[PDB]
Amino acid sequence: RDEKDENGKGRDVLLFVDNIYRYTLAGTEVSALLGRMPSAVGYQPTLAEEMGVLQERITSTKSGSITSIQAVYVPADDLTDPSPATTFAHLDATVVLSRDIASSGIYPAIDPLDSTSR
């Protein structure tokens, strides 16, 4: 992103991340062995801080731009779970897929009453 050329402008960058939820899951797997106390449903007490530390770097500044697409996993089909609920506030466009539409043979199974954009 922050790369320039002599008499040459910058370049646009596309970034693709697959299942950013596994990052928080791996953080969960080692929290107890580090000596912390659990919170919520067995989650680490530093979920939001360590999500935000990574999320604030994926951005576009005055010098260069980044377009990113991420896939977010929803455990046990529960949108109320702390990880997706914390993740919801870091995005500009959110697409929500539902199993009820998928089981009816409709593809892509995008829920039109829960998808928003700025």
Partner: protein
């Protein structure tokens, strides 16, 4: 009338214990009106309120089946 069969057809007929029958037919009119009014009341009360009340609130529970709190 004829020697083998006798039949008289009447649009409105009833046993004429008196020269008038309105005071007897009014009881049947009252019975019919009362039955109609009670039947309408029973149908309305049994269906319109009850089915709507049952169907009032069901989704706030279905939407939270997979919640773990």
């Amino acid at each position: 009338v004829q020697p083998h069969v006798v039949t008289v057809l009447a649009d409105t007929a009833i046993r004429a214990d008196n020269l008038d029958e309105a005071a007897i037919l009014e009881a049947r009119k009252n019975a019919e009106q009362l039955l109609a009014n009670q039947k309408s009341d029973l149908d309305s009360a049994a269906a319109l309120a009850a089915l709507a009340e049952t169907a009032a609130q069901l989704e706030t529970i279905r939407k939270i089946k997979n919640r773990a709190q």
